[PDB]
Structure formats: structure tokens, C-alpha cells
Design an enzyme around this catalytic site. Structure first.
Site, short mmCIF file in Angstrom:
data_model
loop_
_atom_site.label_atom_id
_atom_site.label_comp_id
_atom_site.label_asym_id
_atom_site.label_seq_id
_atom_site.Cartn_x
_atom_site.Cartn_y
_atom_site.Cartn_z
N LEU A 16 -27.40 -39.91 81.72
CA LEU A 16 -27.33 -38.92 80.63
C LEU A 16 -26.97 -39.48 79.27
O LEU A 16 -27.35 -38.92 78.25
CB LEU A 16 -26.37 -37.76 80.98
N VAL A 24 -22.34 -41.56 81.23
CA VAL A 24 -22.39 -40.22 81.82
C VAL A 24 -23.64 -40.10 82.68
O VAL A 24 -24.73 -40.47 82.24
CB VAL A 24 -22.27 -39.08 80.76
N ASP A 137 -14.64 -38.26 66.39
CA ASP A 137 -16.05 -38.63 66.59
C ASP A 137 -16.97 -37.40 66.55
O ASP A 137 -17.90 -37.28 67.34
CB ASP A 137 -16.17 -39.41 67.92
#
Ligand SMILES: COc1cc(-c2ccc(O)cc2)cc2cnc(Nc3cnn(C)c3)nc12
Length: 292
Positions: A16, A24, A137
């Protein structure tokens, strides 16, 4: 029982996202081996050093403490025997990142829709601020799409907890940093606060209204403004001087005036003059209301 996930039952489905320190994966938690198990998002470390495992355990505790409609849901943790490697189990949001989703559909997502996502991001960020967490972020690549009507903040990998007695967190030895989303005081002094997350939010608003047009990205535009000949540390030096002299990302083509005004207010050099996330959500919801 349910937040406890046995590693042997997690079936790898697809990759992902790849990060700074980890990755991920979309997995099926299938303890029946009949492919009827739940699909989840699994975050794991690519380099699981002592320091990285300690920061990762902090990210896990941060995510577990957040419960908001616009923040990815924590599901649980996997523990490996021995060296205690960790896997963070989360809900799987099937539409992927907002960056990819917007880059795919472009102008087919109208201003009313971009504003619904803007409002949802402000509310997620406002809630984060109540826990004294600093995202550090915020970018469209770190926002996920649950469905056409809902987005959620993800990737708490850089998130910091403010000390009890201060309104900023100073990062002594920075790792990979998204400098083109950073507030000037973050570039000069490595100071992060709710106000520097508001600066980042203004860059996210810019990203949304450019529809992720590659030539218009914050790195392409800042690089053009400082000169494409700038490299390594010289980029940071020139970006600081640019921001100090009021160099800013331009108004995106076709961006409404009221929205561009919000971006520019988020990009104030004076930290105290930047708007609050509570006020931003109020202003955005008023704009959506006027537009309707
Ligand atoms: C990088 O992608 C994700 C990151 C996280 C994440 C990581 C760390 C953290 O603290 C919080 C959330 C969670 C994710 C959940 N669901 C998806 N889905 C997806 C992604 N692509 N496509 C096609 C579907 N992606 C996720």
C-alpha cells in the site's frame, strides 16, 4: 481478544505504501484459512532497529489514543517472539491516498467537494491539537480516502507530543523531513507546534486546489523560485531566505479568492498570527454553506 492479532493468520494481499522507516500492506486476517477474514491495513518496519522500534511503539500509542471520524482507526497490534518486532493493525481505507485519488479524478471533484475534504482535515487536525500532538507531516499523500464523502488523516510516523510546559517541540537530530511543507521556524530552528501544522495545512489546501498537477507541486514550485541549480543543504538555505522575503506558492489556477486568502493566512511568518484549526473549520464550513 480482538485487538490481539496472531501474525501467522495475516495473509499478504498487496503493498500500500513505502515510508522512511517502514511499509503498509493490505492483509486479510484469516484465522479460518477460508479467505472470509477481515481486510486490514498493516504497518511494519523495514529496518526494525532499537530506536525505530521505540519510535514506532510511540506512534502506535498515539494512534490508539485518537478516536475521531477523520483519523484512521487503530485496530490492534501484532507481537513477534524474541526481539519483539511490532505490526500496527488499522482499518483499510479502500480509495487510497487523497493525493492519488485527486490526481486520478482531477477537476471531476468540484470545489464544493474539495471544501468538504478541507473541513474534514481541519476537524481531524483540531482534534489532534486537543491531545497536544503535532503531526509534522500533513500533506495529501498522508490523508486517506474512506469513500467519496470522507477523508481521514493517516501516517502519524513523525508525530510529536508537546512537553507539559512548552507550546513547541524541538527536533534535535532530524531524519528525512518534508521541507517544502515546513514553516520557516521549523526550517531554521526545528521547532514544531500547532502553528507549524497550520502552515502545513495551508500547503495541503494549495495541493488540493492544484489538483496535484505535477508541474505545480510545492517541491516543483519552490525549486523554480529558488532556482533548479540549488542542491542538497543549499536548497534549505535558499528556501529559508525565500520564505523570509515573502516568497510563497502562487494562487492555483481557478482557485476561489476566499480559499487563496486562507492559504496565505496559514503562511504567515509570524507564528502567533496564523489562524487556529477551530477557526479554519468554521470559515471553511461558512464558505461551503455560501457555495451551496
Ligand atoms: C500509506 O497508506 C496507509 C497508511 C496508513 C497509516 C500508517 C501509519 C499510521 O500511523 C496511520 C495510518 C493506513 C492506511 C489504511 N488504508 C490504506 N489504504 C490504501 C492505500 N492505498 N490504497 C490503494 C489503499 N492506506 C493506508
Amino acid at each position: 481478544d480482538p485487538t490481539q492479532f496472531e501474525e501467522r493468520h495475516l495473509k499478504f494481499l498487496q503493498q500500500l505504501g513505502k515510508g522512511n522507516f517502514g511499509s503498509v500492506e493490505m492483509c486479510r486476517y484469516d484465522p479460518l484459512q477460508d479467505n472470509t477474514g477481515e481486510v486490514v491495513a498493516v504497518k511494519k518496519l523495514q529496518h526494525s532497529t532499537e530506536e525505530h522500534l521505540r519510535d514506532f511503539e510511540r506512534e502506535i500509542e498515539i494512534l490508539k489514543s485518537l478516536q475521531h471520524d477523520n483519523i484512521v482507526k487503530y485496530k490492534g497490534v501484532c507481537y513477534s517472539a524474541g526481539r519483539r518486532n511490532l505490526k500496527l493493525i488499522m482499518e483499510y481505507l479502500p480509495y487510497g491516498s487523497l493525493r492519488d485519488y485527486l490526481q486520478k479524478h482531477k477537476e471531476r471533484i468540484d470545489h464544493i467537494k474539495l471544501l468538504q475534504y478541507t473541513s474534514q482535515i481541519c476537524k481531524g487536525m483540531e482534534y489532534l491539537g486537543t491531545k497536544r500532538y503535532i503531526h509534522r507531516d500533513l500533506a495529501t499523500r498522508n490523508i486517506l480516502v474512506e469513500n467519496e464523502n470522507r477523508v481521514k488523516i493517516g501516517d502519524f510516523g513523525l508525530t510529536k507530543v508537546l512537553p507539559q510546559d512548552k507550546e513547541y517541540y524541538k527536533v534535535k537530530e532530524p531524519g528525512e523531513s518534508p521541507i517544502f511543507w515546513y514553516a520557516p521556524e521549523s526550517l531554521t530552528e526545528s521547532k514544531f507546534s500547532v502553528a507549524s501544522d497550520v502552515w502545513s495545512f495551508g500547503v495541503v489546501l494549495y495541493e488540493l486546489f492544484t489538483y496535484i498537477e505535477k508541474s505545480k507541486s510545492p517541491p516543483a514550485e519552490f525549486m523554480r523560485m529558488i532556482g533548479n541549480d540549488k542542491q542538497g543543504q543549499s536548497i534549505v538555505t535558499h528556501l529559508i531566505e525565500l520564505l523570509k522575503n515573502n516568497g510563497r506558492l502562487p494562487r492555483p489556477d481557478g482557485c476561489p479568492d476566499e480559499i487563496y486568502m486562507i492559504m496565505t493566512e496559514c503562511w504567515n511568518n509570524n507564528v502567533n498570527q496564523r489562524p487556529s484549526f477551530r477557526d479554519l473549520a468554521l470559515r471553511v464550513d461558512q464558505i461551503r454553506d455560501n457555495m451551496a
